[PDB]
Design an enzyme around this catalytic site. Structure first.
Site, PDB file in Angstrom:
ATOM      1  N   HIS A 157     -26.805  17.292  -1.265  1.00  0.00           N
ATOM      2  CA  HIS A 157     -27.982  18.113  -1.033  1.00  0.00           C
ATOM      3  C   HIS A 157     -28.442  17.864   0.405  1.00  0.00           C
ATOM      4  O   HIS A 157     -28.540  16.710   0.848  1.00  0.00           O
ATOM      5  CB  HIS A 157     -29.124  17.671  -1.997  1.00  0.00           C
ATOM      6  CG  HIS A 157     -30.406  18.417  -1.777  1.00  0.00           C
ATOM      7  ND1 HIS A 157     -30.741  19.534  -2.518  1.00  0.00           N
ATOM      8  CD2 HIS A 157     -31.441  18.233  -0.915  1.00  0.00           C
ATOM      9  CE1 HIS A 157     -31.902  20.017  -2.081  1.00  0.00           C
ATOM     10  NE2 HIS A 157     -32.340  19.266  -1.102  1.00  0.00           N
ATOM     11  N   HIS A 178       0.883  -1.184   0.000  1.00  0.00           N
ATOM     12  CA  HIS A 178       0.000   0.000   0.000  1.00  0.00           C
ATOM     13  C   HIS A 178       0.913   1.225   0.000  1.00  0.00           C
ATOM     14  O   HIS A 178       2.107   1.110   0.273  1.00  0.00           O
ATOM     15  CB  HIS A 178      -0.855   0.000   1.277  1.00  0.00           C
ATOM     16  CG  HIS A 178      -1.834  -1.126   1.369  1.00  0.00           C
ATOM     17  ND1 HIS A 178      -2.994  -1.209   0.619  1.00  0.00           N
ATOM     18  CD2 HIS A 178      -1.743  -2.245   2.103  1.00  0.00           C
ATOM     19  CE1 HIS A 178      -3.612  -2.341   0.950  1.00  0.00           C
ATOM     20  NE2 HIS A 178      -2.849  -3.014   1.804  1.00  0.00           N
ATOM     21  N   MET A 190      -9.727   2.716   0.443  1.00  0.00           N
ATOM     22  CA  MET A 190      -8.488   3.379   0.855  1.00  0.00           C
ATOM     23  C   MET A 190      -8.478   4.819   0.370  1.00  0.00           C
ATOM     24  O   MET A 190      -7.720   5.204  -0.533  1.00  0.00           O
ATOM     25  CB  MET A 190      -7.237   2.649   0.387  1.00  0.00           C
ATOM     26  CG  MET A 190      -7.195   1.234   0.932  1.00  0.00           C
ATOM     27  SD  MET A 190      -5.550   0.501   0.999  1.00  0.00           S
ATOM     28  CE  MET A 190      -4.669   1.584   2.155  1.00  0.00           C
ATOM     29  N   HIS A 230      -5.490   9.115  -0.921  1.00  0.00           N
ATOM     30  CA  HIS A 230      -5.912   7.748  -1.211  1.00  0.00           C
ATOM     31  C   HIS A 230      -4.661   6.897  -1.477  1.00  0.00           C
ATOM     32  O   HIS A 230      -3.584   7.431  -1.811  1.00  0.00           O
ATOM     33  CB  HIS A 230      -6.906   7.731  -2.391  1.00  0.00           C
ATOM     34  CG  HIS A 230      -6.338   8.194  -3.705  1.00  0.00           C
ATOM     35  ND1 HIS A 230      -5.610   7.392  -4.569  1.00  0.00           N
ATOM     36  CD2 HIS A 230      -6.504   9.386  -4.350  1.00  0.00           C
ATOM     37  CE1 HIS A 230      -5.291   8.116  -5.669  1.00  0.00           C
ATOM     38  NE2 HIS A 230      -5.826   9.312  -5.572  1.00  0.00           N
ATOM     39  N   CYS A 231      -4.836   5.584  -1.393  1.00  0.00           N
ATOM     40  CA  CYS A 231      -3.779   4.657  -1.771  1.00  0.00           C
ATOM     41  C   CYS A 231      -3.723   4.639  -3.310  1.00  0.00           C
ATOM     42  O   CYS A 231      -4.720   4.864  -4.006  1.00  0.00           O
ATOM     43  CB  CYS A 231      -4.140   3.301  -1.188  1.00  0.00           C
ATOM     44  SG  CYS A 231      -2.876   2.017  -1.470  1.00  0.00           S
ATOM     45  N   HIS A 288      -3.673  14.624  -2.425  1.00  0.00           N
ATOM     46  CA  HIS A 288      -3.931  15.650  -3.452  1.00  0.00           C
ATOM     47  C   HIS A 288      -3.529  17.054  -2.999  1.00  0.00           C
ATOM     48  O   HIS A 288      -3.466  17.969  -3.816  1.00  0.00           O
ATOM     49  CB  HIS A 288      -5.423  15.742  -3.830  1.00  0.00           C
ATOM     50  CG  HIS A 288      -5.810  14.540  -4.650  1.00  0.00           C
ATOM     51  ND1 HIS A 288      -7.080  14.509  -5.188  1.00  0.00           N
ATOM     52  CD2 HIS A 288      -5.200  13.342  -5.049  1.00  0.00           C
ATOM     53  CE1 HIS A 288      -7.237  13.387  -5.916  1.00  0.00           C
ATOM     54  NE2 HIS A 288      -6.131  12.648  -5.843  1.00  0.00           N
ATOM     55  N   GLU A 311     -28.878  24.901  -3.737  1.00  0.00           N
ATOM     56  CA  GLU A 311     -29.740  23.761  -3.384  1.00  0.00           C
ATOM     57  C   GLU A 311     -28.913  22.473  -3.370  1.00  0.00           C
ATOM     58  O   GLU A 311     -29.043  21.669  -2.458  1.00  0.00           O
ATOM     59  CB  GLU A 311     -30.966  23.701  -4.318  1.00  0.00           C
ATOM     60  CG  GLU A 311     -30.669  23.346  -5.778  1.00  0.00           C
ATOM     61  CD  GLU A 311     -31.920  23.461  -6.644  1.00  0.00           C
ATOM     62  OE1 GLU A 311     -32.982  22.822  -6.376  1.00  0.00           O
ATOM     63  OE2 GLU A 311     -31.790  24.109  -7.709  1.00  0.00           O
ATOM     64  N   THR A 312     -28.135  22.267  -4.420  1.00  0.00           N
ATOM     65  CA  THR A 312     -27.391  21.031  -4.609  1.00  0.00           C
ATOM     66  C   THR A 312     -26.048  21.462  -5.173  1.00  0.00           C
ATOM     67  O   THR A 312     -25.984  22.400  -6.001  1.00  0.00           O
ATOM     68  CB  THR A 312     -28.138  20.125  -5.609  1.00  0.00           C
ATOM     69  OG1 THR A 312     -29.419  19.862  -5.005  1.00  0.00           O
ATOM     70  CG2 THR A 312     -27.381  18.847  -5.923  1.00  0.00           C
ATOM     71  N   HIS A 353      -7.693  -0.390  -4.966  1.00  0.00           N
ATOM     72  CA  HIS A 353      -7.458  -0.045  -3.563  1.00  0.00           C
ATOM     73  C   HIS A 353      -8.393   1.094  -3.162  1.00  0.00           C
ATOM     74  O   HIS A 353      -8.921   1.112  -2.035  1.00  0.00           O
ATOM     75  CB  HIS A 353      -5.991   0.343  -3.337  1.00  0.00           C
ATOM     76  CG  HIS A 353      -5.112  -0.872  -3.246  1.00  0.00           C
ATOM     77  ND1 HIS A 353      -4.293  -1.152  -2.163  1.00  0.00           N
ATOM     78  CD2 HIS A 353      -4.927  -1.900  -4.135  1.00  0.00           C
ATOM     79  CE1 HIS A 353      -3.648  -2.300  -2.385  1.00  0.00           C
ATOM     80  NE2 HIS A 353      -3.979  -2.758  -3.595  1.00  0.00           N
ATOM     81  N   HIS A 382     -27.965  13.693  -4.660  1.00  0.00           N
ATOM     82  CA  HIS A 382     -29.306  13.868  -5.252  1.00  0.00           C
ATOM     83  C   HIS A 382     -29.429  13.181  -6.621  1.00  0.00           C
ATOM     84  O   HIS A 382     -30.230  13.603  -7.467  1.00  0.00           O
ATOM     85  CB  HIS A 382     -29.704  15.354  -5.261  1.00  0.00           C
ATOM     86  CG  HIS A 382     -31.183  15.565  -5.159  1.00  0.00           C
ATOM     87  ND1 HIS A 382     -32.094  15.179  -6.118  1.00  0.00           N
ATOM     88  CD2 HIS A 382     -31.898  16.105  -4.141  1.00  0.00           C
ATOM     89  CE1 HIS A 382     -33.311  15.548  -5.724  1.00  0.00           C
ATOM     90  NE2 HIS A 382     -33.245  16.107  -4.512  1.00  0.00           N
ATOM     91  N   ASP A 423      -1.185   8.833  -1.429  1.00  0.00           N
ATOM     92  CA  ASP A 423      -1.089   9.992  -2.332  1.00  0.00           C
ATOM     93  C   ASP A 423      -2.002  11.090  -1.776  1.00  0.00           C
ATOM     94  O   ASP A 423      -3.200  10.878  -1.554  1.00  0.00           O
ATOM     95  CB  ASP A 423      -1.563   9.607  -3.727  1.00  0.00           C
ATOM     96  CG  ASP A 423      -1.975  10.718  -4.698  1.00  0.00           C
ATOM     97  OD1 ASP A 423      -1.876  11.900  -4.335  1.00  0.00           O
ATOM     98  OD2 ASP A 423      -2.450  10.396  -5.825  1.00  0.00           O
TER      99      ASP A 423
HETATM  100 CU   LIG Z   1      -3.726   0.156  -0.706  1.00  0.00          CU
HETATM  101 CU   LIG Z   2      -5.826  10.927  -6.816  1.00  0.00          CU
HETATM  102 CU   LIG Z   3     -34.800  16.955  -3.521  1.00  0.00          CU
END
Ligand SMILES: [Cu+2]
Ligand SMILES: [Cu+2]
Ligand SMILES: [Cu+2]
Ligand SMILES: OC[C@H]1O[C@@](CO)(O[C@H]2O[C@H](CO)[C@@H](O)[C@H](O)[C@H]2O)[C@@H](O)[C@@H]1O
Ligand SMILES: OC[C@H]1O[C@@](CO)(O[C@H]2O[C@H](CO)[C@@H](O)[C@H](O)[C@H]2O)[C@@H](O)[C@@H]1O
Ligand SMILES: OC[C@H]1O[C@@](CO)(O[C@H]2O[C@H](CO)[C@@H](O)[C@H](O)[C@H]2O)[C@@H](O)[C@@H]1O
Ligand SMILES: [Cu+2]
Ligand SMILES: [Cu+2]
Ligand SMILES: [Cu+2]
Lengths: 345, 345, 345
Positions: free
Chosen positions: C248, C87, C143, C127-128, C92, C272-273, C138, C299, C90
């Site tokens: 939402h 494993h 992960m 994430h892995c 971001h 709203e969303t 993964h 939603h 990373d």
């Molecule tokens: Cu992993």
């Molecule tokens: Cu990524």
């Molecule tokens: Cu709705």
């Protein structure tokens, strides 16, 4: 009656871009481009699967055209008689006649000349759109590219400061719908028309079999990785004519991103991942700060790793240990460590 | 105790909109609307496929309600005893009680009166939401519409300038999930309850069989194309209660777009394609510059051409050859042309 | 050579967040975190379906890490020898070496220490990403988590006014791809490696079988609903490492939303969303105005109600009848009512 200087542009194959000025003091010109439709079988993945493609200028995506706000763009579209189907062109940058599609329908053996005024700045899709179900089929067969309409003063940050790129790449992303036989193997066909019925059935379920940059899985990895250098500001134009995408530069960011792709709007800053709506082009600037390999993906990682949608950049320069460093290389977990007392056990 | 003038609004079927003021000097009122649920079989495509729909006021989408910031909206929701199921209403514009759903559950033969204060400007979805798996089923069966809450000063460009539309249309987009038999033909049912089990299985795979505007493939093409005139500023409200969409006006642009749909945020300018997140309404202004047919689509072109999601506008006026012109009509490729020497051959 | 104070942070299981300051006058520190990979079988829905998961710190999502702009983040990643696979991690948020993935690959029985400088504000995925097809596998096995990099002055509204939250929750949304047998029942496996081949086939069709918050359908409903009080400003961080989502708050709004998740950009107001692009984290503030249950969903209501993607908030306080009121409780439709004369009949 349109009395402006004419300038012929020679296009180049993506992901490279024909030479152009960013800021210019030249006045409006008639910028002349030629696109030739080519239907042909193409290889689309690393196992050698072939595909009945249809292209502008023999590439997926079609080439990036670059002009300035206020230019006129005069496109000669050619459909050689070696092709089997009618084709046309629709520019999302243009105003009127379905983007030009209603003025450019040509049979094999014909050509047509369209002129549109570049009144809207940004990056925009262009694609074939013959009519009815032929529209999605021609587009997902490869007939789409992009045009960039720069402001005459070049790009800015939306807050009154000029931006300039040292390097530009155009990444066209293509969703492909390849039929499979009963055993699950991709089927081959002798012509686009032979492939159609089975392909339309795959298209109807809306799930691509391949999602590729520059026309093929692995196109922009290996020997064809994109080059850059620490310190360079690189513009990455990304288009998708039919389906959404979520670009991400692994190990980097989007310093300035126009995800809707239009330079009249200020870019967003410091993005991890951005969003290209199907039917559009967007653009991201990034100034490289670290050398090494970067992967550029759509961040549905299934599409990126398993359906073909990964490019690489190979960046030369000196590593900055302040930004990131491996403090301790992999080592055995200490005998004395006590991880069995952690809250989640 | 709420002592304000009451005004009854008569709704109209989409894509038209009931008459209203854009800017107003009237103070807050209680705006009274009535929505009547109608479950009924409806035709949803050009082959005559029928569908067990559930609607507000007999249409998909339900009608557009238009009020101003600070109004109170008093909705009488009626569920006639000819219907078979309980229904309710949830306004994304409203604050509290699941948007009103927790106060409006009515059996066949009952009605209920809900009042909500219009404290948030923008276009917003409303939809039925009875509880649990009934929520997506009622919504994808047709029970959704939109409400627009205008600023009292009307729209502006986010930079201190008033915008006014000459014309408004409401495009409700509906994802539908119609079961098929073993042979691939759409199945018919005698009632919504009979259709449910098979429909839920299609819904679970998240891929619609139809994506339609105004309730049916071809609803807004042919005789029912949307009218406009060169020079008019047209507001296009677009909603999707359950699934994303990427609207695009073929041959035009979005001059001002609120893709998240909320007028407290400045619009973006000069878009090619915008993005309606499932569960929301957005809005675009466009001033027509060219006459002729325009197609308005979601720009997944498979959905637009093959699953039903295309509308037309028919625009009257005079063509502007400066913006676009056919310089040379289709003609045979010149004998002397030299396309075999192009870089991509 | 990096001579800054070190501070150890104890993480907590989502949807809670470790304690932290919003605004701070402390200078940059080295913030020390530990993440331990745990592969284990987990229950993922209300029918008891089990899943071969892989996690950071035993939870899906992994825990939220919170630091300030300019801090250095020193992560010890541990892969106990009870695990079966390599494993890595990373971020971001980080610059270089594939976000740290190229410096953190550890076999079972090993640990590694990575330091990255928090130069970019916002919420970000981690994430892995071991390499090739292992990356999506993964991640969709669990992960992934998120890190928030606050400005040192805390959040602001993008127009020069401070924002402060009374409460923060982290909602990690997970798309899961569980194989089914010929009869349609979910299959169980004795190990991740045994599950792989069948799982990769489901992943390739891009349609999840489950879409869950905090690792399981119903995780944040019932006894585990999220608490709040009328008047509190609540920050809701939402991440999705692989697939888009459209959050939402049913009955509420997003008062301030950074849907791309980066605090250098002004939030949008009154949504709203909103939209979390796969591969990113976003954040929304909302000041509760009404007591009662709220559902927080993606939603696409099919995913929310039928695939697991619903959380609840239980909000205490006094109801505001000005914002919303039931004017008339459900009652029989009046004998005298005339609904048969409505335009849509
Ligand atoms: Cu992993
Ligand atoms: Cu990524
Ligand atoms: Cu709705
Ligand atoms: O409405 C008049 C009539 O003019 C037509 C004739 O074909 O063409 C107009 O629009 C074309 C672009 O779509 C222009 O090339 C043309 O010059 C302009 O006259 C028809 O569309 C229309 O019915
Ligand atoms: O918490 C007190 C108690 O009040 C209830 C009684 O049903 O209702 C409150 O909220 C309703 C909207 O959801 C209002 O219509 C009502 O007037 C208000 O008193 C319960 O929800 C709650 O358990
Ligand atoms: O280009 C020189 C050479 O340096 C390498 C050696 O492995 O490492 C550089 O980048 C690493 C991060 O990816 C740093 O940890 C390392 O300190 C730095 O020297 C190679 O990547 C490269 O081929
Ligand atoms: Cu074509
Ligand atoms: Cu198009
Ligand atoms: Cu209903």
């Amino acid at each position: 009656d349109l009395k402006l200087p004419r300038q012929r542009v020679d296009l180049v194959a993506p992901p490279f871009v024909h030479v152009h000025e960013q800021a210019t003091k030249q006045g409006p010109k008639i910028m002349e481009f030629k696109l030739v439709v080519q239907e042909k079988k193409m290889v689309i993945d690393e196992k050698g699967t072939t595909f009945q493609a249809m292209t502008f200028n023999g590439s997926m995506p079609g080439p990036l055209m670059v002009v300035h706000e206020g230019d006129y763009v005069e496109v000669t579209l050619v459909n050689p008689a070696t092709n089997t189907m009618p084709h046309n062109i629709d520019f999302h940058s243009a105003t009127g006649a379905l983007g030009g599609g209603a003025l450019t329908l040509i049979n094999p053996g014909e050509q047509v000349v369209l002129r549109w005024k570049a009144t809207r700045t940004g990056v925009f899709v262009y694609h074939c759109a013959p009519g009815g179900p032929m529209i999605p089929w021609h587009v997902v067969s490869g007939m789409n590219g992009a045009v960039m309409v720069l402001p005459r003063d070049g790009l800015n940050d939306g807050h009154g400061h000029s931006l300039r790129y040292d390097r530009i790449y155009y990444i066209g992303e293509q969703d492909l719908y390849v039929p499979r036989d009963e055993k699950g193997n991709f089927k081959s066909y002798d012509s686009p028309g032979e492939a159609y019925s089975d392909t339309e059935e795959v298209m109807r379920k809306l799930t691509p079999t391949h999602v590729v940059f520059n026309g093929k899985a692995g196109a922009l990895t290996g020997k064809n990785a994109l080059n850059a250098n620490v310190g360079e500001n690189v513009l990455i134009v990304h288009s998708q004519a039919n389906r959404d995408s979520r670009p991400h530069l692994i190990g980097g960011h989007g310093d300035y991103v126009w995800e809707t792709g239009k330079f009249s709007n200020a870019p967003e800053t410091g993005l991890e991942t951005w969003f290209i709506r199907g039917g559009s082009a967007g653009a991201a600037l990034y100034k490289f700060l670290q050398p090494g390999i970067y992967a550029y993906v759509t961040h549905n990682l299934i599409e990126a790793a398993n359906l073909g949608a990964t490019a690489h950049f190979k960046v030369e320069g000196k590593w900055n240990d302040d930004l990131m460093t491996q403090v301790k290389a992999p080592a055995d977990i200490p005998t004395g460590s006590t991880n069995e007392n952690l809250y989640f056990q």
